[PDB]
C-alpha cells in the first residue's frame, strides 16, 4: 500500500543524483528549470533508440549531458551529422556550453527503465500482457540478474474493470539498502486510456 520510490530511497547510497552540481539562493531555481527542459527534448527526440538515463554536470556555463542509449548508433548517425545537430538545438535554446557525450549500455535487458519501455511498447502494439511480462522477466533473469519484477495496472486488455498484473522472480528486498535496484516507469497510450508499467531489477549488493 505504501512502497516508496526505491530511487529516492537511496539518494544517500546506490543511486547518485541524476543531475549533479551546485547553486545558491538565486541560481538553483533557474539551473534546474533549464536543466529539466534539457532532458525534455532528449526524452522525446532520442528515446527513438532506447534512451534510459541522462546525466547533467555543471558549475559555470559548462554542461556535460551523458546519454545512455542502448544503441549509440542512432544518436551519432554514421560519423557526426546526427550527434552534432543535437548540440545545435541545445545551444540554440540555451546560450551555454554543450558537451553531449554518449555512454553505452552493457545490456539493455538489465536497465529497468528500458525493460519498462520494452513491455510498455508491446502493450500498445496490442499483445498479451501476461505472456509479455513473463518473457520480459524470464529474459531479464536469464540474461544474468539476482532478481527482477514487472507490474502493469489499469485496463489490462481494454477491459471494463481495471486490474493489476503481477510477475516476479528472485530476491528483490525493497527494504534493504545494500541492495540496489534499477527502477523505471513507463506508460502506454491506448484507445482505452493510460496504463502504468514498472520494472524492478536487482543488481549489486554490499
Amino acid at each position: 500500500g505504501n512502497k516508496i520510490h526505491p530511487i529516492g530511497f537511496r539518494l544517500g547510497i546506490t543511486r547518485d543524483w541524476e543531475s549533479r552540481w551546485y547553486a545558491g539562493k538565486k541560481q538553483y531555481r533557474h539551473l534546474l528549470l533549464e536543466d529539466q527542459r534539457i532532458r525534455g527534448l532528449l526524452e522525446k527526440e532520442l528515446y527513438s533508440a532506447g534512451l534510459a538515463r541522462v546525466d547533467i554536470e555543471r558549475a559555470a556555463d559548462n554542461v556535460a549531458v551523458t546519454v545512455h542509449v542502448a544503441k549509440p548508433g542512432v544518436v551519432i548517425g554514421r560519423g557526426g551529422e546526427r550527434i552534432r545537430v543535437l548540440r545545435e538545438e541545445l545551444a540554440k535554446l540555451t546560450g551555454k556550453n554543450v558537451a553531449l557525450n554518449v555512454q553505452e549500455v552493457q545490456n539493455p535487458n538489465l536497465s529497468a527503465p528500458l525493460v519498462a519501455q520494452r513491455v510498455a511498447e508491446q502493450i500498445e502494439r496490442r499483445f498479451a500482457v501476461r505472456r509479455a511480462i513473463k518473457q520480459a522477466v524470464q529474459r531479464v533473469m536469464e540474461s544474468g540478474a539476482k532478481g527482477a519484477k514487472v507490474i502493469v495496472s489499469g485496463r489490462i486488455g481494454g477491459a471494463e474493470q481495471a486490474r493489476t498484473e503481477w510477475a516476479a522472480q528472485g530476491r528483490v528486498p525493497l527494504h534493504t539498502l545494500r541492495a540496489n535496484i534499477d527502477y523505471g516507469f513507463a506508460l502506454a497510450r491506448t484507445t482505452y486510456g493510460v496504463l502504468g508499467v514498472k520494472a524492478y531489477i536487482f543488481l549489486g549488493e554490499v
Binding site: 520510490h5 529516492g8 544517500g12 543511486r15 543531475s19 551546485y22 534546474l32 529539466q36
Partner: protein, 60 residues
C-alpha cells in the same frame, strides 16, 4: 481557466501585487516553493528521481 490563467501569471502587464507564485511544471498556485519554483507534489516526484541535486530523504 487553466492555460490563459498561467499566461496571466506570466505577462505581468499590470500592477505589482497582482503578480503571484506559480508552478513551473504543472501550473499550481498554492503550495509553490520559491526555491525551486515548484509545487509540493512534483517536487516530491523529482526529489525521488534525484533530479534535485543535494536533496535527500531526511530523517532524525
Amino acid at each position: 481557466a487553466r492555460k490563459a490563467l498561467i499566461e496571466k501569471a506570466k505577462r505581468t502587464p499590470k500592477f505589482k501585487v497582482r503578480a503571484y507564485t506559480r508552478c513551473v511544471r504543472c501550473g499550481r498556485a498554492r503550495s509553490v516553493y520559491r526555491f525551486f519554483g515548484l509545487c509540493r507534489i512534483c517536487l516530491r516526484e523529482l526529489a525521488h528521481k534525484g533530479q534535485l541535486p543535494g536533496v535527500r530523504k531526511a530523517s532524525w
